[PDB]
From a paper:
As mycobacteria lack DNA mismatch repair, the only process that can ensure low levels of mutation during DNA replication is the replicative DNA polymerase and the associated proofreading exonuclease. Instead, the Mtb replicative DNA polymerase DnaE1 uses a PHP-exonuclease that is intrinsic to the protein itself. Recently, we have shown that in mycobacteria, the PHP domain is the essential replicative exonuclease and that the DnaQ-like DEDD exonuclease in contrast is dispensable. In addition, we have shown that the PHP domain of Mtb DnaE1 is a potential target for new antibiotics as its inactivation leads to strongly decreased growth rates and renders mycobacteria sensitive to nucleotide analogs that are used in antiviral therapy.
The crystal structure of M. tuberculosis DnaE1 was determined by X-ray crystallography to 2.8 Å resolution. To promote crystallization, the C-terminal region was removed (residues 942−1187), analogous to the structure of E. coli DNA Pol IIIα12. The final structure contains residues 1–933 and can be divided into four domains: the N-terminal PHP domain (residues 1–300), the thumb domain (residues 451–542), the palm domain (residues 301–450 and 543–591), and fingers domain (residues 592–933). The only exception is a loop in the thumb domain (residues 501–508) that is poorly defined in the density, most likely due to the absence of DNA. The polymerase active site, comprising aspartates 421, 423, and 587, is located at the bottom of the deep cleft between the thumb, palm, and fingers domain. On the other side of the thumb domain, ~40 Å away from the polymerase active site, is the exonuclease active site. It is located in the center of the PHP domain and consists of nine conserved residues that coordinate three metals. The coordinating residues comprise five histidines, three aspartates/glutamates, and one cysteine. The presence of a strong anomalous difference map around the metals at the high energy, but not the low energy data set, unambiguously identifies all three metals as zinc. Unique to the Mtb PHP domain is a long, 29-residue loop (residues 77–105) adjacent to the PHP active site.
Numbering used by the authors: 7 to 500, 509 to 933
The structure:
């Protein structure tokens, strides 16, 4: 009654502009005892999911909206438009004639949905430079359920006022009021005692009176608290690229832009403009539950099947076909029944479409010559996955467990992902969009959060400018090295640090460190995730806000992938792997240099050569086996079969190493150590389950097999035990020990045997390794070793190609080449191609491997070298090439790289000759 709600408010998702993080904002909102809060971010609704959930979870009522950017003309119009005289630039259309602000809020779930797509359309259609803009025409099409206002000072109505254009201001206000309706338009009033706001206040209340618009007090909060104001000021500097000293920069006036208490707020408005604060409460109480928007709906695409099938029929049909291909002279024994079991679970859980989709993507990759992976994750324990080509690991010969993948007794979404040649993700993503709908497939946003290291570089540019680099560079070196891609949380220095001393010493560094903490974990920008993609049965604008990446036109989700899946959108990882690129290249090299045409999918898994190579530990550049201590272990282990490859991958991790499991495995395998039983009563019942791993427990699947044998568990229920012994919640451990123990009692085991097993498994289950993932990786390792062992030059060539023009990474493999007796010939205009090549027994340097040279240009060189070349001499090269300053920048680097020495002319010469040629 004498309370208040902030409706105009900027979150950290007003990137580089709002400094109010949602969690502290809610905290504050509550101790000020306020019933509700709004979210009004500049130009986007990326925080909506977070805000809604956080607000709801704290019983504050969320008001969700957006401070739209509105074009001065049509949103499609990319001309800049100004309404006053140049002498009034500072009062005129923001963004130099690009936009005005508009505060918009959702009264109910219809309005929310409408705001989502109004946002989306702003980006799809109304983009000028960095601003996504709506216009009046577009907003009118989607006005239902929305409340708008007359706006902040950067709004249209005030801009008009400030400009002297009273007629236009009043006319603007009537246009907007007409569009949303008399009951959803408010006269927005804001006071930070600035003279910009006072100038307009009278004109403004005139308009309110004239057109009959209620007043609304708001604060345009850009930070939570009053002390936070200084951090806000530094943030704006990161956004502007300007100095704190530099007075001319964009900044706010004093510190009024926090979440003021009902009291302070009523103190400003009650006497001055009766009703303003009360309207906030009228609005808050008017606002509905948004919950229909976050209610999960099954939005998984429906694979289109031939006529007279359904998803389940078609899956059977396809799985059958699959087995036929895979086992062309009849599938072996027990396969069909396994398949039928899986198909049955799958249909039962409602996932046949998903399988069909991933199959179809894999199908396309092959039709297009895109190398896919043998597959990763849980899916490798599914005979269906294997049948359909989703994986290439037959789960049966490797003893992988379907119920680890899809547990019939738990309801939950499996992860079925493609993974392929890193250089071809583009095509894969485009294909998906074509197949499933351009308005139904989107890549997923990531949020660029300000990290510790760039926080400091930022803090320095803020205090010092361009010359700030020195101090900046100075601070950053003092830093402990990473772990291994994660620099030390700043607050943390509140520790192996010398630098800490650096601050206690230098007063300037204390102030840079201070400013950087104010900056940490705010959001710098929006990225596109490396691999996640979201798909839907319905247009995605119906579910979530989205945006268009300006550079390529890519459509990206507004929320991250957990928020998306949280409401029943399908997410898949379209993963690009470079080892797959390297594999494809080595294979190509073998076609070219040896005329063999290798098909990895049919390489034996027992190749003597390979295991020999493994035994030496000459694994530089073989997938997952290159580490130093890895090489040691491989040597100590003398691997001999595929299962050993699968084990090292699992064993070369901190958990098993902590237990010495890897060395133990090695030693036991080579008769240097006896195989200890978990307990004597346990020896014979568990012997075969643990045999392959020389009596040690290495995989999740073994925990399951163990619980089934000894405790009479379902594989499904053993899966559930395994998950739980992983999480370690007392209440659940005890129910489960109850069960485990009872089962073992029933099977006749002493309390000692039960206690041994339990005690062994319990810590081991924190870290136990998913055997399906180890087989998938293992396959790639082995394949990779097989190529190095049997095709050294072809493979090393592929490897070096992947290292780009980086001399440092290259020097690592060149050293390897040398240690294997492979000769490395230099870059050459007549003999080098774009990438490194296998030439007989040699590697020939890649042309693109030199500085300043890329496929783009090398392409035309090889082009012309085919039509007319080889080049006879430097001037012949010039006569065969073309006139261009850019062409000259290239030519220079090729000379340096000695690409021309083949011709037999000193290079100092050629530089001089090149300059004339250009003139
Ligand atoms: Zn702002
Ligand atoms: Zn504004
Ligand atoms: Zn604002």
């Amino acid at each position: 009654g004498s309370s208040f709600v902030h409706l105009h408010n900027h979150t950290e998702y007003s990137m580089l502009d709002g400094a109010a993080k949602i969690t502290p904002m809610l905290a504050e909102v509550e101790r000020l005892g306020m019933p509700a809060v709004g979210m009004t971010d500049h130009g986007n609704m990326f925080g909506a999911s977070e805000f809604y959930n956080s607000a709801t979870k704290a019983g504050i009522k969320p008001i969700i909206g957006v401070e739209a950017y509105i074009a001065p003309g049509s949103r499609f119009d990319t001309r800049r438009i100004l309404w006053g005289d140049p002498s009034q630039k500072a009062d005129d259309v923001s963004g130099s004639g690009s936009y005005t602000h508009l505060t918009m809020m959702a009264e109910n779930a219809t309005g929310l949905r409408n705001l989502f797509k109004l946002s989306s359309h702003a980006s799809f259609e109304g983009q000028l430079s960095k601003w996504s803009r709506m216009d009046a025409e577009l907003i009118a099409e989607h006005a239902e359920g929305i409340i708008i206002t007359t706006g902040c000072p950067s709004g249209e109505v005030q801009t008009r006022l400030r400009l002297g254009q009273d007629r236009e201001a009043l006319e603007a206000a009537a246009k907007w009021r007409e569009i949303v309706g008399p009951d959803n338009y408010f006269l927005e009033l804001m006071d930070h005692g600035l003279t910009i706001e006072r100038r307009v206040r009278d004109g403004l209340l005139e308009i309110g009176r004239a057109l009959n618009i209620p007043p609304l007090a708001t604060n345009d909060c850009h930070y939570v608290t009053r002390d936070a104001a200084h951090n806000h000021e530094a943030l704006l500097c990161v956004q502007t690229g300007k100095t704190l000293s530099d007075p001319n920069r964009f900044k706010f006036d004093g510190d009024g832009y926090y979440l003021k208490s009902a009291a302070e707020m009523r103190q400003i408005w009650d006497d001055e403009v009766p009703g303003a604060c009360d309207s906030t409460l009228l609005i808050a109480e008017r606002v509905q539950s948004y919950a229909d928007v976050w209610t999960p709906r099954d939005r998984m695409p429906v694979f289109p099947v031939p006529d007279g099938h359904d998803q389940a029929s078609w899956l059977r049909h396809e799985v059958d076909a699959g087995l036929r291909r895979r086992f062309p002279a009849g599938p072996p024994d027990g396969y069909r029944e396994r398949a039928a079991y899986e198909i049955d679970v799958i249909c039962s859980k409602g996932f046949p479409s998903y399988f069909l989709i991933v199959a179809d993507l894999i199908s396309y990759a092959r039709s297009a010559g895109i190398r896919v992976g043998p597959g990763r994750g849980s899916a490798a324990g599914s005979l269906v996955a294997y049948a359909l080509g989703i994986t290439d690991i037959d789960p049966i010969p490797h003893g992988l467990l379907f119920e680890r993948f899809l547990n019939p007794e738990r309801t939950s979404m499996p992860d079925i992902d493609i993974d392929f040649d890193d250089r071809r993700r583009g095509e894969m993503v485009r294909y998906a969009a074509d197949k499933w709908g351009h308005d139904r497939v989107a890549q997923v946003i990531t949020f660029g959060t300000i990290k510790t290291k760039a926080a400091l570089k930022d803090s320095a540019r803020i205090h010092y400018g361009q010359p700030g680099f020195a101090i900046a560079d100075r601070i950053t070196k003092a830093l402990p090295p990473a772990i291994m891609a994660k620099d030390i949380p700043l607050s943390g220095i509140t520790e192996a640090a010398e630098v800490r001393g650096l601050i206690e010493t230098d007063p300037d560094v204390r102030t840079i460190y201070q400013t950087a903490r104010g900056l940490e974990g705010l959001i710098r920008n929006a990225g596109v995730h490396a691999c996640a993609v979201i798909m839907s049965s319905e247009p995605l604008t119906e579910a979530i806000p989205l945006w268009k990446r300006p550079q390529d036109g890519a459509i990206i989700t507004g929320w991250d992938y957990p928020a998306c899946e949280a409401i029943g959108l399908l997410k898949m990882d379209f993963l690009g792997l470079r080892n797959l690129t390297i594999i494809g290249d080595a294979i190509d090299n073998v076609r070219a240099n040896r005329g063999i045409d290798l098909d990895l999918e049919s390489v034996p898994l027992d190749d003597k050569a390979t295991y020999e190579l493994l035994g030496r530990g000459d694994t530089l550049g073989v997938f997952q086996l290159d580490g130093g201590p890895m090489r040691d272990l491989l040597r100590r282990m003398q691997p001999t079969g595929f299962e050993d490859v699968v084990a090292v991958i699992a064993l070369y991790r901190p958990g098993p190493m902590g237990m010495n499991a890897h060395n133990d495995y090695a030693d036991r395998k080579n008769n240097r150590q006896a195989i200890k039983p978990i307990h004597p009563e346990l020896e014979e019942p568990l012997r075969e389950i643990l045999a392959e791993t020389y009596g040690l427990i290495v995989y999740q699947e073994q925990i399951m097999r163990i619980a089934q044998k000894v405790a009479s568990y379902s594989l499904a229920r053993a899966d559930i035990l395994r998950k739980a012994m992983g999480k370690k919640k007392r209440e659940v451990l005890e129910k489960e020990f109850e069960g485990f123990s009872d089962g073992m009692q029933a099977n006749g085991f002493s309390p000692a045997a039960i206690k041994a097993l339990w005690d062994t498994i319990l810590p081991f289950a924190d870290y136990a390794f998913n055997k399906s993932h180890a087989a998938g990786y293992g396959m790639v390792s082995y394949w990779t070793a097989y190529l190095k062992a049997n095709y050294p030059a072809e493979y090393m060539a592929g490897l070096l190609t992947s290292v780009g023009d980086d001399k440092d990474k290259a020097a690592v493999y060149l050293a390897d080449c040398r240690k294997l007796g492979i000769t490395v010939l230099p870059p050459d205009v007549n003999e080098s191609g774009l990438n490194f090549a296998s030439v007989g027994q040699d590697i020939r340097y890649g042309l693109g491997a030199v500085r300043n040279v890329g496929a783009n240009v090398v392409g035309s060189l090889l082009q012309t070298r085919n039509d007319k070349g080889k080049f006879t001499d430097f001037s012949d090269y010039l006569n065969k090439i073309d006139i261009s300053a850019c062409n000259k920048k290239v030519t220079e680097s090729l000379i340096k790289a000695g690409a021309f020495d083949s011709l037999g002319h000193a290079r100092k010469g050629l530089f001089l000759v090149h300059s004339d040629a250009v003139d």
